[PDB]
Short mmCIF file of C-alpha atoms in Angstrom, two decimals:
data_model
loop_
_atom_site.label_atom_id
_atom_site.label_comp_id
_atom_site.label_asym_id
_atom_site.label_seq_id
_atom_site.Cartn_x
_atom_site.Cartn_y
_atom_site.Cartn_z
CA UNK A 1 -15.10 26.00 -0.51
CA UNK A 2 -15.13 23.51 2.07
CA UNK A 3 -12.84 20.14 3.23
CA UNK A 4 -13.87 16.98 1.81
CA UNK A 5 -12.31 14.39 3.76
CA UNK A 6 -10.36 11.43 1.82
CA UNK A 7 -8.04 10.49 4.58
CA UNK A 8 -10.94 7.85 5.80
CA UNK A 9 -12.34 6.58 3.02
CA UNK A 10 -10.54 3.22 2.58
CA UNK A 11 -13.90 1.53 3.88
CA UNK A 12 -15.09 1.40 0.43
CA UNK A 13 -12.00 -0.10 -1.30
CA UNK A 14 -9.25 -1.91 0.15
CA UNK A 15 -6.03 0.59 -0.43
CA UNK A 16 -4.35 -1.24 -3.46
CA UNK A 17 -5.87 -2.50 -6.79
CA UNK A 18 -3.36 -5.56 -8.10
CA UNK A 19 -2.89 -7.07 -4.45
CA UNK A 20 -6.63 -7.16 -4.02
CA UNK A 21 -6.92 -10.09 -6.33
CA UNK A 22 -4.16 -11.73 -4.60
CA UNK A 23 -5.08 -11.16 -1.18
CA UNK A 24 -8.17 -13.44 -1.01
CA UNK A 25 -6.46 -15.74 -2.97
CA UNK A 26 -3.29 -15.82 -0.72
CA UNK A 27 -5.02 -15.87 2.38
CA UNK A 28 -7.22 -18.98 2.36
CA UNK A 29 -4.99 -21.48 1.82
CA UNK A 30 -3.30 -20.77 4.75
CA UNK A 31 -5.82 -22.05 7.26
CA UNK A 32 -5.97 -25.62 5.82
CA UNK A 33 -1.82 -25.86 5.37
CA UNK A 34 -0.50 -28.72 6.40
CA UNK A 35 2.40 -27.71 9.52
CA UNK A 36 5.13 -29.97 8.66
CA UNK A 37 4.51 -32.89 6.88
CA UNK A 38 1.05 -33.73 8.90
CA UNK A 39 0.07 -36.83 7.58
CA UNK A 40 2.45 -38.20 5.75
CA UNK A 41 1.24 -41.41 5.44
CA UNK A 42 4.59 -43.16 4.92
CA UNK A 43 3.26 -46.53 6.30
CA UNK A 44 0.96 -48.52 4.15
CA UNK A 45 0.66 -52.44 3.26
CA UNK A 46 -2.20 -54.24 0.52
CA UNK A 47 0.27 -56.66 -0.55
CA UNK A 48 2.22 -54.01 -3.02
CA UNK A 49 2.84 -51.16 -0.80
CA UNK A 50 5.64 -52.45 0.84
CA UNK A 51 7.56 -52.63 -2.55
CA UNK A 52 6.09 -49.30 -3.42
CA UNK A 53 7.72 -47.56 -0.01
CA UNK A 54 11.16 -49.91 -1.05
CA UNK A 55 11.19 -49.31 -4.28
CA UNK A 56 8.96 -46.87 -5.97
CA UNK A 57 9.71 -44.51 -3.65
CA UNK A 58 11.37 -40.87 -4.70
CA UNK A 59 14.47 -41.30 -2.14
CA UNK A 60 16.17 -43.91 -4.56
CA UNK A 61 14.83 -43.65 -7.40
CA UNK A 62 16.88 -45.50 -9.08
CA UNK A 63 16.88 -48.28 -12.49
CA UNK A 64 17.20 -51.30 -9.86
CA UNK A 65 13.22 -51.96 -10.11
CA UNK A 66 13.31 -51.94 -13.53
CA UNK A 67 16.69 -54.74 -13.73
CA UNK A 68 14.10 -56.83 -11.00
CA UNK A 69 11.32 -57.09 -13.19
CA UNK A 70 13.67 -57.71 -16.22
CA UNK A 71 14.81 -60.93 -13.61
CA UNK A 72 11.19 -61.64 -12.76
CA UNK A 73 10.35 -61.84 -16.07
CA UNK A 74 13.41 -63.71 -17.28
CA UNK A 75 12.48 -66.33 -14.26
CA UNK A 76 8.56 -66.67 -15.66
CA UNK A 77 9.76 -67.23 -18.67
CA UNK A 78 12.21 -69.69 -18.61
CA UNK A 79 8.67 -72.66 -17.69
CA UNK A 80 7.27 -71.70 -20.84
CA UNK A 81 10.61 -71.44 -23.20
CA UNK A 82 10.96 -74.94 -22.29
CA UNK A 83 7.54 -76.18 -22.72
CA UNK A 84 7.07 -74.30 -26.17
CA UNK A 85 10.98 -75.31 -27.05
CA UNK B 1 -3.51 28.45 21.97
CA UNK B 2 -3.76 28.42 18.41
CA UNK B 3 -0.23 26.08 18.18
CA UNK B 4 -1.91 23.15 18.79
CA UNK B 5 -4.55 23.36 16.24
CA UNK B 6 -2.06 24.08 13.22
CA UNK B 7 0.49 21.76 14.77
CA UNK B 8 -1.70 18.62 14.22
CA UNK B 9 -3.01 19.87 11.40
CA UNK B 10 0.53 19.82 9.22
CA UNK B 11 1.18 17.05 11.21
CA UNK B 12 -1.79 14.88 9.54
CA UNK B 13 0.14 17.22 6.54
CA UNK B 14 3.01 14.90 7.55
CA UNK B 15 1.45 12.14 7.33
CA UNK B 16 -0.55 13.09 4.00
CA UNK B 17 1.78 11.96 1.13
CA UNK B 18 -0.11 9.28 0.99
CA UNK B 19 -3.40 10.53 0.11
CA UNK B 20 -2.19 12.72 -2.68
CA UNK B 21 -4.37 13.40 -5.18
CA UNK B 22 -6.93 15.30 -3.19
CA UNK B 23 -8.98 18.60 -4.12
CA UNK B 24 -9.87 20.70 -2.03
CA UNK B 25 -7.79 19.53 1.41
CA UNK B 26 -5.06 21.82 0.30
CA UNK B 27 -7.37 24.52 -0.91
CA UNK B 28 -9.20 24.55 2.60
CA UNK B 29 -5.60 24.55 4.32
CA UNK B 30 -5.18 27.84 2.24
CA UNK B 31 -8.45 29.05 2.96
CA UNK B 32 -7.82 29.02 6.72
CA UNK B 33 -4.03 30.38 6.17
CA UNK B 34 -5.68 33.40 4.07
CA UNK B 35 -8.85 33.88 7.09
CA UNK B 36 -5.94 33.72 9.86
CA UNK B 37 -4.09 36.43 8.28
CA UNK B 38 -6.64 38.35 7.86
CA UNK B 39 -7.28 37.96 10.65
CA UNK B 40 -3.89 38.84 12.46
CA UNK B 41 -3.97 42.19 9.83
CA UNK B 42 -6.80 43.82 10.76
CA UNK B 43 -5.85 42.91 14.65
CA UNK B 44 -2.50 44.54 14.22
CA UNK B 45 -3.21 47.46 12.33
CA UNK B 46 -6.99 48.47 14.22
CA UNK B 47 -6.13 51.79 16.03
CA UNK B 48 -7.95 52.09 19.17
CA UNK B 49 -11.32 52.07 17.75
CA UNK B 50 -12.56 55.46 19.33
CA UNK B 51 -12.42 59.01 19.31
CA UNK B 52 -10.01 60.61 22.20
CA UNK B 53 -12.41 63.04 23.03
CA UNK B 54 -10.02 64.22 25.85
CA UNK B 55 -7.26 65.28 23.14
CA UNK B 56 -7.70 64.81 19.78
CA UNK B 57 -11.30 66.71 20.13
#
């Protein structure tokens, strides 16, 4: 008989069910986002990092590490092939 | 004077199909279209609401 009045009633409920969900979980990790690359941390050294930044790093990538160590341990054991034999 | 009260109002009309769904917003906009005319009938088609005592007595 009267008007009820919807068009202001979005204080209640966000407008949108789904994207509710999403919203708060969209919007907070976008205050503690890194900008570009903020600490990267590329520079490190206790002894093995340097050979970790060379080697085990994901720009080469490559089998050469693995061929080194094959050397390495070739080289180690070449002292004891000749003591045992 | 009126044209400024309707105009807004089916403007906010406009802008309503969003908040479809609604009961009675519609049924109140018909409500004041039906008291309006009304209105506007009995306006038009009152006679001069006396007797012409001069003539027609």
């Amino acid at each position: 008989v009267s008007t009820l009045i919807p068009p202001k009633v979005v204080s209640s409920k966000n407008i949108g069910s789904a994207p509710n969900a999403k919203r708060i979980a969209n919007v907070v990790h976008f205050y503690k986002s890194l900008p570009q690359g903020p600490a990267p941390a590329i520079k490190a050294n206790t002894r093995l990092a340097r050979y970790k930044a060379k080697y085990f790093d994901g720009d080469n990538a490559s089998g050469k590490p693995l061929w080194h160590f094959a050397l390495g341990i070739i080289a180690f054991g070449y002292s004891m092939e000749y003591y045992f034999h | 004077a009126k044209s400024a009260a309707n105009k807004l109002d089916w403007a906010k009309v406009i802008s309503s199909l969003r908040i479809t769904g609604s009961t009675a917003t519609q049924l109140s906009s018909f409500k004041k279209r039906n008291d309006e005319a009304r209105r506007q009938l009995l306006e038009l088609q009152s006679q001069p609401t006396e007797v012409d005592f001069s003539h027609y007595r």
